[PDB]
Design a protein around this ligand. Sequence first.
Ligand SMILES: CCOc1c(F)c(S(N)(=O)=O)c(F)c(NC2CCCCCCC2)c1S(=O)(=O)CCCO
Ligand SMILES: CCOc1c(F)c(S(N)(=O)=O)c(F)c(NC2CCCCCCC2)c1S(=O)(=O)CCCO
Ligand SMILES: [Zn+2]
Ligand SMILES: [Zn+2]
Lengths: 260, 260
Amino acid sequence: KWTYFGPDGENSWSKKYPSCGGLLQSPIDLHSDILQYDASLTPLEFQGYNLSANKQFLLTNNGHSVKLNLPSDMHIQGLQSRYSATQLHLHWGNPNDPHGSEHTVSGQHFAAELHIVHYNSDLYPDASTASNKSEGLAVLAVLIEMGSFNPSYDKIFSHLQHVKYKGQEAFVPGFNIEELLPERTAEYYRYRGSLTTPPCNPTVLWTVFRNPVQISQEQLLALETALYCTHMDDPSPREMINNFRQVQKFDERLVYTSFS
Amino acid sequence: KWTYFGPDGENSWSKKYPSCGGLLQSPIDLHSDILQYDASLTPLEFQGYNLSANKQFLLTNNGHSVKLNLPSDMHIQGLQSRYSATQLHLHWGNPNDPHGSEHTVSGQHFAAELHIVHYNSDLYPDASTASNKSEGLAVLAVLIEMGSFNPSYDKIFSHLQHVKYKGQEAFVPGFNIEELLPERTAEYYRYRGSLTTPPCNPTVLWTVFRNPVQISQEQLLALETALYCTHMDDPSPREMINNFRQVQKFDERLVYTSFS
Ligand SMILES: CCOc1c(F)c(S(N)(=O)=O)c(F)c(NC2CCCCCCC2)c1S(=O)(=O)CCCO
Ligand SMILES: CCOc1c(F)c(S(N)(=O)=O)c(F)c(NC2CCCCCCC2)c1S(=O)(=O)CCCO
Ligand SMILES: [Zn+2]
Ligand SMILES: [Zn+2]
């Protein structure tokens, strides 16, 4: 029903998902003219991020990205409610243009981006219910650049061959999800925005960490080449590349920083 | 019917103008991964650009930009067909974020952008007929940076406070339009794209000059602050700001450069 390329791509999302042409759209370019330091922003705390190795967590190719289900005990503290892991997923580019982050910083794309999606567990019973309601969701964005091999991201990437096609699922043993975050999480950008995919609901509080993490060139190539958007038995298989939205207009509004 | 902000803004253009969701859309980010030097790209020649000082040309606020009508006397030589001028216009941002070029270079916006629109007069009678047809249009793009005052651009900008509202018109004495082009016009980016506004027809051969021109801070602020999208009698005026399209995806394709 929607894609990132061709007729059903992002310029046409608004047809069946009005909100994709509505208010508070994400992602955005983070640049000096729209930033303002807010001394009252607090470091987040990641409570229940260290998942038991004796437990397993479902990895799914949903046709648009790869997601890992996360438990609702996993949560935070630092916003104006409690916000609870639902899943994480990634966005990336392609081997010819390996620059597929969603947010940009001073016009620069990063190689990829990790999103850790939570929901307002104080106001709503689950993520789906929260998704189209006030204050529903909160997403952590980690920018990814090419560099040294990252064993923590390999805890995900080493399973990708078991979820090659849409609808395929496989389990991942628990590991410490905090290992996927950067240094100095205390420094971040924060703004009110949207889901970056249909239905584009304007109900997410974004936190984009200032500092990127690194993965190796080999890990990045593996991610860009592992997956397909189509199901087994689809007559036209389509490789899963360039699964990021273009940056949106951001006018008469501010991104707040926890760093001066 | 269309705008750059709100429900009729660019994520919605495809709902009224199907080509805005189609192939070959402009503008784009000009960055190394999608560039290829093409030594066969020769300098264009700008013929008839020295408009008679004894003639006047119509400047109109069309509710989307300010446009100057140009005569068919003006020709680009050097392409497979001769293209003849029809009009020029500009795109810009706003005083709080004065970075409103359409094309970007290595992720960076410039302050504004000038487009000189031409049509394939060897094949088509006029620009309207050419606009939806094979090899119909060629646009020259000049990137504009804030810095030094530009006397040549002021031959247009000195009239802005007299075309403040939609439908208003002024006359501009003829001058040498080539004075609006940057240094080393032999150096450019070339690609096949589209109109950057509705109807978004994928019929444009783009030439984006490598080097920007400069206009002063005062000139840029005049451009950003003088004009409204609404009629003079309108009780609720809308400022003409941020009249640029976001960059489009550009995958499995190349921009050719005449410089290395
Ligand atoms: C390709 C990745 O898709 C995203 C996604 F981009 C974002 S983002 N970038 O964080 O805005 C997502 F949040 C999600 N999942 C959300 C889960 C919580 C609520 C249920 C509705 C889906 C949104 C998902 S998704 O669940 O993977 C697909 C949702 C289609 O509606
Ligand atoms: C805001 C400026 O609008 C552009 C414009 F952005 C471009 S661009 N960026 O060069 O693609 C245009 F080419 C034009 N005008 C063209 C004139 C020649 C063909 C007739 C159809 C309109 C396109 C015009 S426009 O004529 O000013 C308005 C066109 C509405 O269809
Ligand atoms: Zn995401
Ligand atoms: Zn234009």
